[PDB]
Design a protein around this ligand. Structure first.
Ligand SMILES: NC(=O)c1ccc[n+]([C@@H]2O[C@H](COP(=O)([O-])OP(=O)(O)OC[C@H]3O[C@@H](n4cnc5c(N)ncnc54)[C@H](O)[C@@H]3O)[C@@H](O)[C@H]2O)c1
Ligand SMILES: NC(=O)c1ccc[n+]([C@@H]2O[C@H](COP(=O)([O-])OP(=O)(O)OC[C@H]3O[C@@H](n4cnc5c(N)ncnc54)[C@H](O)[C@@H]3O)[C@@H](O)[C@H]2O)c1
Lengths: 231, 50, 148
């Protein structure tokens, strides 16, 4: 676009629920600026550029950023896991996360937010490892009927939030969206199972109708015989 | 690493699926038999009363 | 359309049951303006642009907005779930929603409305996850006769 004026003071407007890290290389002093404030670089200061993770499978180094967003958000990853029956099935999860900054005036705690070079990929891979480890000791049927509880117990512990003390990032919830077997043959087998369940329901209704018809026929026959006797 | 191990595990998971379907079918059959026996007993008692 | 006059004070008319967030980057003061009021930017203020979710399957980043509507509304999503009998069936739900602002003069509580970058997609995905989790442990027949 239009070239910037190199002689003008470089400035940046931090959004709401965001922070930046700048170090004054001349005066030897770092600072983290919070909130919607406007940050202006000194003659020697620099911006701490963050290279984060993004994408459907959460590839690394896919989103360079200047300010760190520390507000309630969520990122989604596609996790491929295997069950104790060796059935390959991929997941789609959503991790509600936010940064817990106890004191925004603390030079030590606030510096911890930028301590982890990539919180997105780190959290995604850690939670994926937990989920893969927990599921592998569970059969396919139990996971299918109880995937929510299994995943919630795997991601958290014995605990409502999965706090990461390296930077303060906490995962307050996990939301499983899709659990689909990778192979088509498993899908075909499950389709045959559901068709057999439908057949079972229809056969049950037919049997109930037949039993009711037999009962009514017997009652009518008995009444007819008694009436014949009276006649 | 080998594809043959993957094929064997796929056959194992398909056998597990078949096991689950057979279990559900057996449960349905048992429930149907129980209900049929109950209906038959009630019908016989009603015939005796008639 | 017709280009705006850059030298004119930028103004916006917030609708009824709506709010905007503006931060005065010079004087270092934020504010949330409620109701049908008219909002005029200062020389350094800015509008908090909201990128929300929309569409039949509720895709993200499909509706950029300037004001946040906090009145009784509803959004609809199409949820695909599976039963304990492994029968695949998709749903169509409608979520009646509204924002509860206890005090409109509170700088902290009112700032919480814009805390979530995307409330539509977040709520839709959370409720979809709940529904998918609960249904998967229920057979097809019981769900069919008792889905409500
Ligand atoms: N409460 C909510 O539900 C809520 C709140 C905020 C945002 N959102 C939206 O949910 C969407 C989820 O989409 P996705 O995860 O599939 O896309 P994605 O995988 O490309 O998103 C990458 C993740 O990195 C985070 N991120 C992006 N830029 C950042 C920065 N400068 N500093 C710190 N973190 C940053 C985002 O929150 C996002 O979750 C996001 O695009 C986001 O806009 C939801
Ligand atoms: N009481 C009611 O029944 C009621 C009230 C208001 C609106 N509605 C209408 O119901 C329709 C539902 O359609 P849909 O959900 O399939 O379409 P959609 O999926 O495109 O709608 C997206 C949702 O985002 C919300 N939204 C849109 N712009 C917004 C903004 N600037 N700030 C905050 N929220 C915003 C809307 O309420 C809507 O429910 C909406 O289009 C809306 O006009 C119903």
């Amino acid at each position: 676009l239009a070239p910037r004026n190199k002689t003008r003071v470089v400035s940046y407007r931090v959004p709401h629920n965001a922070a930046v890290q700048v170090y004054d290389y001349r005066e030897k002093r770092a600072r983290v600026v919070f909130g919607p404030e406007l940050v202006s670089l000194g003659p020697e200061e620099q911006f701490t550029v963050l290279s984060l993770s993004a994408g459907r499978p959460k590839r690394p180094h896919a989103r360079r950023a200047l300010c760190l967003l520390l507000g309630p958000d969520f990122f989604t990853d596609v996790i491929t896991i295997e069950t104790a029956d060796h059935a390959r099935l991929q997941l789609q999860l959503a991790y509600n996360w936010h940064f817990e900054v106890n004191d925004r005036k603390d030079p030590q705690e606030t510096a911890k937010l930028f301590s982890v070079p990539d919180f997105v990929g780190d959290a995604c891979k850690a939670i994926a490892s937990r989920v893969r480890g927990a599921v592998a000791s569970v059969t396919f049927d139990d996971f299918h009927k109880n995937s929510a509880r299994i995943i919630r117990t795997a991601v958290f512990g014995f605990r409502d939030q999965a706090v990461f003390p390296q930077n303060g990032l906490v995962v307050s919830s996990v939301d499983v969206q899709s659990v689909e077997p990778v192979d088509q043959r498993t899908r075909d087998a499950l389709q045959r199972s559901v068709q057999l369940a439908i057949e079972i329901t229809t056969n049950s209704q037919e049997a109930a109708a037949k039993h009711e018809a037999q009962r009514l026929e017997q009652e009518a026959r008995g009444r007819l015989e008694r009436q014949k006797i009276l006649d």
